[PDB]
Amino acid sequence: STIEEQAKTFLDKFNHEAEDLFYQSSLASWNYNTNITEENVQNMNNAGDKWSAFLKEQSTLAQMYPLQEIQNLTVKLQLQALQQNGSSVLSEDKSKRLNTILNTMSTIYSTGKVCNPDNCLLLEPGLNEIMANSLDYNERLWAWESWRSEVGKQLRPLYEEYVVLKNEMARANHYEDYGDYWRGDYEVNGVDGYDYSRGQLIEDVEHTFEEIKPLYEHLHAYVRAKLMNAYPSYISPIGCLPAHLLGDMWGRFWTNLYSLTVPFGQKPNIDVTDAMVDQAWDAQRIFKEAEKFFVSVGLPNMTQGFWENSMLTDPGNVQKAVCHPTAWDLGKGDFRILMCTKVTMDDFLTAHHEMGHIQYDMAYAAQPFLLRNGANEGFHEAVGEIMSLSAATPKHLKSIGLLSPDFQEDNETEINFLLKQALTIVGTLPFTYMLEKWRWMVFKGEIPKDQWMKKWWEMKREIVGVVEPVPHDETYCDPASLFHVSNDYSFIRYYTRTLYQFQFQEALCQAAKHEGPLHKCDISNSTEAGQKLFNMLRLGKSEPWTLALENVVGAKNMNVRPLLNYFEPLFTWLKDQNKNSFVGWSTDWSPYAD
Amino acid sequence: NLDSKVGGNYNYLYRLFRKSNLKPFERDISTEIYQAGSTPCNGVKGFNCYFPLQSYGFQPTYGVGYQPYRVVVLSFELLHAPATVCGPKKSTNLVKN
């Protein structure tokens, strides 16, 4: 008679029907990604529309069960996602044009290309590969500047419509703006004291970034000092670095600059590529050695169907498969991974990452279909990264025999390793905080359409310290060409991931009683840390992420302390080398303004 | 390796909803629509009216834990009727003198 009995009955039946159609929808996308055929492209759209329209039909009966009469926390969370109508709240004209803009911006990004000024290569892989190893000033500027001319300027009217259509959806959902929609993933309500406001994330990412500045300023001055001798006129000691020299198009990762930034070139570097050649290992034993890593910590092994259905290579051009590593979770215990596995040092750490998502999905797999998910968008990739961090340590490499036991491990070897991770990690946080905060300000309405590029480069010199060689007007749009913004994917998950992975790295090493620096820690063979982590992995989003985080690290929010401690050995070395230079940068310097 | 086939097998169903719990050794084949609330159903699907029988997805691609198992349950009951079924016997060699 009560609403709770009627709501639970709807959820018990919905979990079965939604799980059956989601498996066929994910299976149709699997056959299309592994094999390109005319039959699979139609099955992906057919099975994809059946699952998409299924949530739209069940959303009508979901809004008929108010959450005010339900005293259960697990029931209200299962009805929280079903209460939203998605795009049904938009008008018929705006709903149909919404999928058109998303498909048009995704097509232009895939079909976009920059023809050689001297002699036409597509961006991915073509332009993304050249910009990595290019040391030329003009060659990098030609591909960086001419791209946004036919893309950033062309996607501007499509980006303006993208802002208007998505703002009307948040207004019908009783959200302040569309920037608050992505902040609703961290929303926590229903528990006394653990409630987390949506507007709190704005103050959280801003406060944690303040303590990141002293660590980032020393690294930004270290990279600038190495590239200062090349172009002393364009690169000022108190100025900023050019945008096209960051190592790739958008400057997401600085790993491409690790070649020239090596502190000591007279010492060898740790590489498992040449070691796997003499051992003669194939793609079959790479996942097998990584499966034993999950057994040493107490986590269950992989099912027989997982290793049998794995795709280990690309059989030529007859049957083409996407080589981008991705962990696909279909359902009902069906776990598969599509990756092209060669013999490299990076594929070894990638195998622990791709298997980390599958191992993460095994803990909460006992939960209903509505309760199967990460607690947030940052916990998905963070679980796979902490598995790879323990594998990259010299202690784990000497255990299985990749690295020689007589290899000398000292400060000179470890500082070289911490710098490579810093270019990927430390360089990501200011860039992710910059672009995400810019989207929140434009979607809110604080920045007029004419000041989009005016505030973009102005706030860029303040955060990441990057100035444009060629000034741009309001016609260009930098985020429009980005992969995540154009494809409507969460850009905030990259900033919080760094803070979540380092908290878990410090907590697991304290449970196993590891001593010394944190980068020397290895979680292998230690079953004590796997038991404390397994309790949170099986919770998913059925429990508040603030409550599940306290059960591991004892903290109710994000904290910079594990970020500083793990980078502390590198921070002390960068401070001594930057004494001869100026720590920090100025926002009043420009390459074309003298 | 037998029941599961490519495309799914919808022949095997199960009763998801019932107003109460079944008694021991009871079989209910009734297809009557389950009524969750007080809303009338009358055999028509709708609000608070759900079709109880649901389908088992069967394909070889599913995980090992969820693979369907054929279960044969033997019910052993001793009544006052004369006993007939007994265990197997054993015959030995015959010797004389």
The torsion of the CA quartet A117, A123, A126, A128, rounded to 10 degrees, works out to 110
Q: Is A454 annotated as a binding residue?
A: no
The torsion of the CA quartet A517, A518, A523, A527, rounded to 10 degrees, works out to 80
Neighbours of A354 (CB within 10 A): 23
* Strand, helix or coil for residue A70: coil
Residue A497, min C-alpha distance to chain B (Å): 30
Partners of residue B57 in chain A, C-beta under 8 Å: 20, 23, 332
Is B50 close to A13, i.e. CB distance below 8 A? yes
d(CA A432, CA A418): 21
What is the identity of the amino acid at B32? E
Six-digit token string for A29: 């996308």
Is A16 close to B54, i.e. CB distance below 8 A? yes
Whether residue A309 lies within 8 A of chain B, CB to CB, comes out as yes
Q: Is A396 annotated as a binding residue?
A: no
Residues A430 and A216: beta-carbon distance below 8 Å: yes
d(CA B89, CA A266): 84
Six-digit token string for A61: 């009966």
Phi, psi of A60 (to 5 degrees): -70, -40
> Looking at residue A467, what DSSP letter applies?
E
Residues 544-563, chain A: which have Cβ within 8 Å of B? Answer: none
Q: Tell me the angle at which helices A345-363 and A283-296 cross, rounded to the nearest 10 degrees.
A: 50
Neighbours of A285 (CB within 10 A): 12
Q: Which residue of B has its CA nearest to A333?
A: B63
Q: Is A494 annotated as a binding residue?
A: yes
Helix, strand, coil distribution of chain A in percent, nearest 5: 60, 5, 35
Angle CA A480–A483–A489, to nearest 5: 100
Any bridge partners for residue A196, and if so which?
A188
Whether residue B66 lies within 8 A of chain A, CB to CB, comes out as yes
Phi, psi of A353 (to 5 degrees): -75, -45
User: How does DSSP assign A323-351, residue by residue?
Assistant: -S-EEEEEETTEEEEE----S-HHHHHHH
DSSP β-ladder status, A326-331 and A466-467: unpaired
Neighbours of B66 (CB within 10 A): 14
Residue A388, min C-alpha distance to chain B (Å): 26
* Backbone break loci in chain A, preceding residues, C–N > 2.5 A: 119
Residues B48 and A6: beta-carbon distance below 8 Å: yes
Any bridge partners for residue A311, and if so which?
A338
Six-digit token string for A428: 């990501």
Whether residue B39 lies within 8 A of chain A, CB to CB, comes out as no
Partners of residue B62 in chain A, C-beta under 8 Å: 305, 332-334
d(CA A529, CA A531): 5
Residue in B16, B36, B64 nearest the CB of A303: B64
Three-state SS string across A178-227, please?
A: CHHHHHHHHCECCCCCCCECCCHHHHHHHHHHHHHHHHHHHHHHHHHHHH
Q: Which residue has the tokens 């502190």?
A: A263
Alpha helices by DSSP H, listed for A303-427, are: 304-308, 345-363, 379-391, 394-400, 411-425
Residues A331 and A358: beta-carbon distance below 8 Å: no
Catalogue the E-assigned strands of A423-511: 466-467
* Strand, helix or coil for residue B91: coil
What is the identity of the amino acid at A466? V
User: How does DSSP assign B37-77, residue by residue?
Assistant: SSS--TT--BTTEE--EEEPP--TTS-STTS----------
d(CA A582, CA A367): 54
User: Which of B61, B62, B64, B69 would you mutate first to test chain A, the one with the most A CBs within 10 A?
Assistant: B61
Whether residue B55 lies within 8 A of chain A, CB to CB, comes out as yes
Q: Does the N-terminal peptide bond of residue A125 adopt cis geometry, omega within 30 degrees of 0?
A: yes
Q: Which residue of A has its CA nearest to B62?
A: A334
Distance of CA A248 to the CA centre of its chain: 17
Residues A188 and A195: beta-carbon distance below 8 Å: yes
Residues A371 and A540: beta-carbon distance below 8 Å: yes
Q: Is A495 annotated as a binding residue?
A: no
Any bridge partners for residue A266, and if so which?
none
Closest CA to A220 of A426, A14, A438: A426
**If you compute the radius of gyration of chain A from its CA atoms, what whole number of angstroms results?**
25
Q: Is A142 annotated as a binding residue?
A: no
d(CA A22, CA A17): 9
* Strand, helix or coil for residue A280: coil
DSSP β-ladder status, B49-50 and B13-15: unpaired
The torsion of the CA quartet A270, A273, A274, A278, rounded to 10 degrees, works out to 130
Q: Which residue has the tokens 């594998």?
A: A391
Is B54 close to A335, i.e. CB distance below 8 A? no
d(CA A526, CA A536): 18
Q: How many helices (H) and strands (E) does chain A have?
A: 25, 6
Helix H or strand E segment including B35: strand B34-35
Six-digit token string for B71: 């279960």
Burial of A159 (0-12, 13-18, 19+ CB in 10 A): buried
Whether residue A308 lies within 8 A of chain B, CB to CB, comes out as no
Q: Which residue has the tokens 């995400």?
A: A436
* Strand, helix or coil for residue A311: strand
Residue B86, min C-alpha distance to chain A (Å): 41
Phi, psi of A23 (to 5 degrees): -70, -45
Whether residue A1 lies within 8 A of chain B, CB to CB, comes out as yes
Whether residue A230 lies within 8 A of chain B, CB to CB, comes out as no
Q: Which residue of A has its CA nearest to B7?
A: A24
N-terminal to C-terminal alpha carbon distance within chain A: 78
Helix H or strand E segment including A495: helix A493-511
Angle CA A115–A120–A126, to nearest 5: 105
Find all residues with CB under 8 Å of A410, minimum gap 6, and list them. none
User: Which of A1, A15, A16, A310 would you mutate first to test chain B, the one with the most B CBs within 10 A?
Assistant: A16
d(CA A255, CA A132): 9
Is B57 close to A332, i.e. CB distance below 8 A? yes
d(CA B57, CA A17): 11
Whether residue B13 lies within 8 A of chain A, CB to CB, comes out as no
Neighbours of A393 (CB within 10 A): 20
Angle CA A218–A222–A226, to nearest 5: 170
Distances (CA, A) of A278 to A58, A273, A525: 57, 9, 26
Residue B74, min C-alpha distance to chain A (Å): 29
> How many residue pairs from chains A and B have C-beta atoms closer than 8 A?
50
Phi, psi of B53 (to 5 degrees): -75, 130
Query: Catalytic amino acids of A?
Result: 354, 484
Is B17 close to A13, i.e. CB distance below 8 A? yes
Any bridge partners for residue B46, and if so which?
B49
Partners of residue A23 in chain B, C-beta under 8 Å: 57
Q: Is A460 annotated as a binding residue?
A: yes
What is the identity of the amino acid at A390? S
d(CA B22, CA B33): 17
Q: Which residue has the tokens 């908290």?
A: A503
Helix H or strand E segment including B14: strand B13-15
Find all residues with CB under 8 Å of B49, minimum gap 6, and list them. B33, B34, B35, B36, B39, B41
Partners of residue A60 in chain B, C-beta under 8 Å: none
Burial of A92 (0-12, 13-18, 19+ CB in 10 A): exposed
What is the identity of the amino acid at A431? F
User: How does DSSP assign A121-187, residue by residue?
Assistant: EEIIIIIHHHHHH---HHHHHHHHHHHHHHTTTTSHHHHHHHHHHHHHHHHHTT-S-SHHHHHGGG-
Angle CA A184–A188–A193, to nearest 5: 145
Six-digit token string for A339: 């990756």
Residue in B37, B47, B62 nearest the CB of A61: B47
User: How does DSSP assign A104-117, residue by residue?
Assistant: HHHHHHHH-EE--S
Q: Which residue has the tokens 């299924």?
A: A54
* Strand, helix or coil for residue B13: strand
d(CA A185, CA A558): 15
d(CA A429, CA A435): 10
d(CA B30, CA A563): 62
CB under 8 Å, gap of 24 or more: what pairs does A542-551 form?
A: A542/A74, A542/A77, A542/A364, A542/A367, A542/A371, A543/A375, A544/A188, A544/A191, A544/A194, A544/A196, A544/A375, A545/A186, A545/A188, A545/A375, A545/A376, A545/A379, A546/A188, A546/A194, A546/A196, A547/A191, A547/A194, A548/A375, A549/A503
Whether residue A124 lies within 8 A of chain B, CB to CB, comes out as no
> Looking at residue B80, what DSSP letter applies?
S
Is A304 close to B64, i.e. CB distance below 8 A? yes
Partners of residue B55 in chain A, C-beta under 8 Å: 20
d(CA A471, CA A187): 39
Partners of residue B17 in chain A, C-beta under 8 Å: 9, 12-13
Residues A475 and A153: beta-carbon distance below 8 Å: yes
Six-digit token string for B8: 């799914």
> Looking at residue A525, what DSSP letter applies?
T
The torsion of the CA quartet B51, B56, B57, B61, rounded to 10 degrees, works out to 160
Six-digit token string for A559: 């904290």
Residue in B37, B62, B63 nearest the CB of A6: B37
Is A9 close to B48, i.e. CB distance below 8 A? yes
Find all residues with CB under 8 Å of B90, minimum gap 6, and list them. none
